[PDB]
Curated annotation (Swiss-Prot):
Residues 355-427 form the DEP domain. Interacts preferentially with RAC2. Interacts with RAC1. Interacts with AUTS2. It is found in: Cytoplasm, Cytosol; Cell membrane. It comes from the Eukaryota. Mainly expressed in peripheral blood leukocytes and brain. Expressed at intermediate level in spleen and lymph nodes, and weakly expressed in other tissues. Residues 224-326 form the PH domain. It comes from Homo sapiens (Human). The chain holds residues 42 to 501 of 1659 of the full protein. Functions as a RAC guanine nucleotide exchange factor (GEF), which activates the Rac proteins by exchanging bound GDP for free GTP. Its activity is synergistically activated by phosphatidylinositol 3,4,5-trisphosphate and the beta gamma subunits of heterotrimeric G protein. May function downstream of heterotrimeric G proteins in neutrophils. Residues 8-193 form the DH domain. This is Phosphatidylinositol 3,4,5-trisphosphate-dependent Rac exchanger 1 protein.
Amino acid sequence: ESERQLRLRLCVLNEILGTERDYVGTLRFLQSAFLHRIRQNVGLTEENVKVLFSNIEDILEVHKDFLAALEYCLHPEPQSQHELGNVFLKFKDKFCVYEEYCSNHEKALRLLVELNKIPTVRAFLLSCMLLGGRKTTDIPLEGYLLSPIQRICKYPLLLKELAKRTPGKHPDHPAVQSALQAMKTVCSNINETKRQMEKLEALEQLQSHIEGWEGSNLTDICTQLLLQGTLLKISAGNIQERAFFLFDNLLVYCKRKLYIFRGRINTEVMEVENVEDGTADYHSNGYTVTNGWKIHNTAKNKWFVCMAKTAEEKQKWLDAIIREREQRESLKLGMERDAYVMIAEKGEKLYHMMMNKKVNLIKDRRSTVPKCFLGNEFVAWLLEIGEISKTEEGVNLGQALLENGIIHHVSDKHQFKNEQVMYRFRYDDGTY
């Protein structure tokens, strides 16, 4: 099985590199979309930025060199002979940059909650993420502000797995084990990361007590266990008692023996339905249901019935299941509502701003095309007027206007580009 422990090591190496790359990119997005753009065109005060982002720029400079040494050891590719323990050890002292950030984290969130109450500041914050390239309906800024705390806690989890796939023969063995101990002591010193590490430890401890795990690791999809309990899975032809675990974003049912993995469901495709005590239907295999409900895997269009011992447990479960749905569905729908309002606002604003003869850009050009403007001119005018800083920001803005039904190509055959492609506001041609 030596080759098994080999490909397994490379997967760890490939992951450490690929995840570190996406981390630095996330840091490089936070400064360009936020810290840099406001430090140029000076409703977000300077103190507001210092509170929200703290030393995120110092964290970047550290991880910009970490990634270099990571790619340095893993050149030309992630090869098994390559050693990575020394890298973590010679950056172990530089990781104290997380001290100030994790301290200011609570204060930053408190500010963000009050800033999001102001509609103009919420829109500006969301406008920064749009211009920076990243989608606004995906991860909220609260999550971006936390990813430093998450990343520094993902290092012990990654090094542990690497140490498992690294034999005592490999010269990196004394270093990987020494680096794992050092990375743990880093997180343990900081209070904010200590709470995070113990929350990730719980997810991984549970996954270790489950045999035959299939799918993505809990530490990569969930954050906390919501409810655990043993129920009856009256699936078609299989009425067996199962141990159910409800996390955020995932539900998994196991076979109690420690547990043995049986199946898992993503809560996004899960739809529950109550069955009154005394009901008997096909999903219950004909048996009378008491203190039970019904689950529907809308991905597979499969229904299966759960039953609890007490009616308290039924309510305890049904209540916890509804909460998870509402919590994530409110966030998602909320980010998607607060993002349409800024585009509609900026769309109507830039329309009237462009209609004035000071910078007339929606001119009837030529067959004649009425009330059209040029993408090249539009992007340039945005930088002149100061609404954007880079040109990549201008196309990201125009595309968001095209996608959100504000503008469109004259022939609806092109997306937004910095070329002299003619676009028109959907107001002028009655398509709004």
